[PDB]
Design a protein around this ligand. Structure first.
Ligand SMILES: COC[C@@H](Oc1cc(C[C@@H]2C[S@@](=O)C[C@H](NCc3cccc(C(C)(C)C)c3)[C@H]2O)cc(F)c1N)C(F)(F)F
Length: 376
């Protein structure tokens, strides 16, 4: 019955993907950002310049105050509010209702995005990183505990944008080829291990621990591919060399300045493909996902009145490990198989197009000593 969940996601470029939910009795409708990088379910519950609607606890007969405060500091953005529980449903999701923890957001700073069209966030990761602490049961744990929904979900994020969140299973009509699985290293973030990196077929040749320093996570709430300082520098250097045929302001490589070309003349060919190899399911085995420039050059509306094609560099430097954000996930079907502690990747039905190249998930590869790639 997964067909009812196909295309249940919407979004705007650089502004996340959201699903429709209802909270309270009678049901109040809200759009909720889908975030595999956090574990709190939180909604605007007070007026805000960027909110067109919000959760009104006073109007819900099933609302229960937990009489505890809470705050969450993200990389960028934070909010604080009051904890409580209430009934929650997903109209274009499984046909169930659950009582879940909800953080009612009363104050925030750089959390809500002007024009994003979402009013809350659904953290889909594990209790370990929930605030105030791991005793606050995350939404998906409540869903699985209270219903017969199987303990997994999958995300098809498509390149204003749409996608699918299949709750409780895998919809085989949403991908082509085979699914390749990498272990979830530890259940807090969706942490994985990258074992090799190549750019246009050239190995970066770093200690693979550098790729996962201090962790690597799959995070739908983050837009960019984010890379640890040393890896970022090596990657940009290689990407610059490959595209040196053209000139870019260095504010572009910092993800600040956008670059434009005459509509339809974007020189895709001069930008390399990036291959990330992930730890596999059997001994000394891995697989790779290959990312095209159409993924890491994010389309942005022209600052000028011109109808050029403009882009921002969507790879940026991190001090908290690798983050495989939305631009990596786009064009792949990603299965969060919590039941079997693994994450699967397959080429998405809405895969990214290139004239002479194609995003891919390929294996098996042999890779020795993969355990040594994890950072401790
Ligand atoms: C520019 O934003 C676009 C972004 O909007 C937001 C998205 C988030 C979710 C964040 C995005 S970034 O902060 C990484 C983080 N995941 C890893 C992480 C890093 C630090 C702390 C935590 C804990 C929550 C576990 C404590 C988790 C993730 O959840 C928070 C926000 F405010 C905004 N606006 C959009 F629109 F989704 F693309």
């Amino acid at each position: 019955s997964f067909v009812e969940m196909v295309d249940n996601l919407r979004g705007k470029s650089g502004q996340g993907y959201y699903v429709e939910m209802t909270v309270g009795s009678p049901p109040q409708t809200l759009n909720i950002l889908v975030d595999t990088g956090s574990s709190n379910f939180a909604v605007g519950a007070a007026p805000h310049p960027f909110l067109h609607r919000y959760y009104q606890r006073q109007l819900s007969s099933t609302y229960r105050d937990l009489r505890k405060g809470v705050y969450v500091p993200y990389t960028q953005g934070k909010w604080e509010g009051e904890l409580g529980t209430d009934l929650v449903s997903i109209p274009h999701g499984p046909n169930v209702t659950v009582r879940a923890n909800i953080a009612a957001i009363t104050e925030s700073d750089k959390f809500f995005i002007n024009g994003s069209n979402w009013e809350g966030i659904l953290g889909l990761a594990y209790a370990e990183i929930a605030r105030p602490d791991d005793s606050l049961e995350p939404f998906f744990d409540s869903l699985v505990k209270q219903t017969h929904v199987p303990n997994l979900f999958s995300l098809q994020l498509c390149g204003s944008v749409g996608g699918s969140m299949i709750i409780g299973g895998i919809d085989h009509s949403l991908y082509t080829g085979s699914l390749w699985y990498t272990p979830i290293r530890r259940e807090w973030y969706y942490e994985v291990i990258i074992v090799r990196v190549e750019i246009n077929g050239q190995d970066l040749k770093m200690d693979c621990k550098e790729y996962n320093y201090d962790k690597s996570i799959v995070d739908s709430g983050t837009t960019n591919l984010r890379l640890p300082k040393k890896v970022f520098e090596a990657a940009v250097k290689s990407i610059k060399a490959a595209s040196s045929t053209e000139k870019f302001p260095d504010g572009f490589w910092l993800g600040e300045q956008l670059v434009c070309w005459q509509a339809g003349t974007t020189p895709w060919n001069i930008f390399p493909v990036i291959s990330l190899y992930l730890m596999g399911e059997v001994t000394n085995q891995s697989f790779r996902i290959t990312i095209l420039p159409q993924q890491y050059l994010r389309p942005v509306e022209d600052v000028a009145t011109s109808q050029d094609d403009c882009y921002k560099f969507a790879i940026s430097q991190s001090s908290t490990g690798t983050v495989m954000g939305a631009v990596i996930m786009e064009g792949f079907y990603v299965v969060f198989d919590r039941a079997r502690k693994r994450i699967g990747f397959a080429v998405s039905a809405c895969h990214v197009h290139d004239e002479f190249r194609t995003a891919a998930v390929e294996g098996p590869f042999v890779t020795l000593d993969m355990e040594d790639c994890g950072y401790n």
